[PDB]
Structure formats: C-alpha cells, structure tokens
C-alpha cells in the first residue's frame, strides 16, 4: 500500500505471442495463502484443493 515509484506497461502482442500459442508464460492460480508485498513463490507442488 505504501508503494512509491512507477509502473510501466505496454502492449506486447507482437513480441510475446505466437499463432501456435506462446505457452512459455505461466501464472499461479491456486495457493494456500495470499502473497505478501514483494513476495515470490516459484514452487510447483500440486495444490490440494
């Protein structure tokens, strides 16, 4: 909540996308708890729902 700085975002459909599907990008959808500010979770263990 006390973040100070700038966030720079732009369209990258011509770089990070392919007609056959650019599957090299992954996102975490399930997790036991929410992430803290500036936290990283690279674990790939199967989440028990």
């Amino acid at each position: 909540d006390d973040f100070t700085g700038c966030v720079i975002a732009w369209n990258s459909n011509k770089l990070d996308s392919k007609p056959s599907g650019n599957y090299n990008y992954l996102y975490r959808l399930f997790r036991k708890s929410k992430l803290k500010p500036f936290e990283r979770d690279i674990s790939t263990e199967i989440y028990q729902a």
Binding site: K36, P37, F38, E39, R40, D41
Partner: protein, 48 residues
C-alpha cells in the same frame, strides 16, 4: 570478553541486517545499558 549482537528482519521482501559489537567484562553476559545497532546489509530476497 567481546559481545556480538545481530538483528535479522525481513519486511516487504527486503532483508535488513543490523550488527554492533560491545566489549563487556567477564562478570556476566548481556549486561544492563543500551547499545544501538547499526544497519550494514540490506538486500531484497522476496521469499517467505
């Protein structure tokens, strides 16, 4: 005898380290008084 103190804090993904040494007599450990620790190392780790 030399006494060493350290403080390890991890807030908002940044790991802060404080360190300061104070020579104390051989009477006992952790004597009374105050000794402020100075920050030396600050680095982000982003881990839990």
């Amino acid at each position: 005898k030399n006494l060493r103190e350290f403080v390890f804090k991890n807030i908002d993904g940044y790991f802060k380290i404080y360190s300061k040494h104070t020579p104390i007599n051989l009477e006992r450990d952790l004597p009374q008084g105050f000794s402020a620790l100075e920050p030396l190392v600050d680095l982000p780790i982003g881990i839990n």
